[PDB]
Design a protein around this ligand. Structure first.
Ligand SMILES: Nc1nc2c(ncn2[C@@H]2O[C@H](COP(=O)(O)OP(=O)(O)O)[C@@H](O)[C@H]2O)c(=O)[nH]1
Length: 258
């Protein structure tokens, strides 16, 4: 039977293993990622409507590439198109740090559900999150979990059964020239890669990500000239990409967290 395929992704020590184990139980297998010794781990569970294959991905701060294997493994999987959606396990006690990865996933346009974990930890650090406010800004569902107790697991399963395209909201606000160059690069990348993904790959190349150049086909030959123009228009275009992301996250966090 064709199963619904979900990628489980989050920072290290966010409750991803614990969430995975509560969801799949004994119904899991362990192997290795193709051509490396890093453990690949997946399992099974059901919701009301769906039979799910849950693929645990290695913990990572980001999808940007002495960049660990975990990170390239996670990014390569997200970019494959194998998953129908992702569950982004976010540690509510370190929200701003954890949202770097979330934004990366949201800019790629993959259907996403945020599992907001470590809520008790947030609580007793005197922080609470405005959950719908965060959902409104992310353009995707935000489901609160205390996953060691199994709290919100039913609500997470309910959200899987309602999965749909993220709201294509504006997130990071890049200077227009960076967007114009990302688009020029996008235009000449392989036609079968979705547009949002080609535009993401383009911004990553401009930022200095080397792995991304391998997806970009002949965009790779145009990159030096794109960077020549931007250096004439601004100080450190790559730093501007980065600050744009961090401004975005910080502004979200100001409103959502207290
Ligand atoms: N307080 C609390 N602890 C949690 C929660 N989820 C996981 N943990 C614990 O935090 C530690 C790290 O969790 P783990 O699932 O191993 O994280 P992973 O690296 O992302 O796979 C473990 O001891 C878990 O039992 C949660 O929602 N609340």
């Amino acid at each position: 039977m064709k199963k619904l395929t979900i990628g489980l992704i989050g920072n290290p020590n966010s409750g991803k293993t614990t969430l995975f184990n509560q969801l799949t139980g004994s119904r899991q297998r362990v192997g290795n990622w193709a051509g490396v010794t890093v453990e690949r781990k997946e399992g099974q569970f059901s919701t009301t409507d769906h039979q799910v294959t849950l693929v645990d991905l290695p913990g990572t701060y980001s999808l940007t590439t002495q960049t660990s294997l975990d990170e390239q493994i996670a990014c390569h999987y997200i970019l494959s198109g194998d998953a129908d959606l992702l569950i982004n396990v976010v540690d509510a006690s370190n929200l701003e740090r954890n949202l770097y990865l979330t934004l990366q996933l949201l800019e790629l346009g993959i259907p996403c559900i945020v599992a907001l974990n470590m809520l008790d930890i947030a609580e007793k650090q005197n922080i609470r999150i405005e959950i719908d406010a965060l959902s409104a800004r992310l353009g995707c569902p935000v489901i609160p979990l205390v996953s060691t107790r199994g709290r919100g697991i039913e609500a997470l399963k309910l959200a899987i059964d309602r999965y749909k395209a993220n709201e294509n909201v504006e997130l990071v606000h890049y200077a227009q020239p960076l967007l114009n160059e990302a688009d020029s690069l996008a235009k000449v990348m392989p036609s079968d890669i979705p547009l949002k993904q080609r535009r993401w790959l383009g911004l990553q190349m401009l930022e200095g990500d080397i792995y991304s150049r391998a997806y970009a086909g002949e965009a790779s030959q145009h990159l030096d000239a794109a960077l020549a123009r931007l250096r004439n228009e601004m100080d450190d275009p790559a730093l501007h990409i980065a600050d744009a992301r961090y401004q975005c996250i910080a502004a979200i966090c100001d409103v959502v967290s207290n």
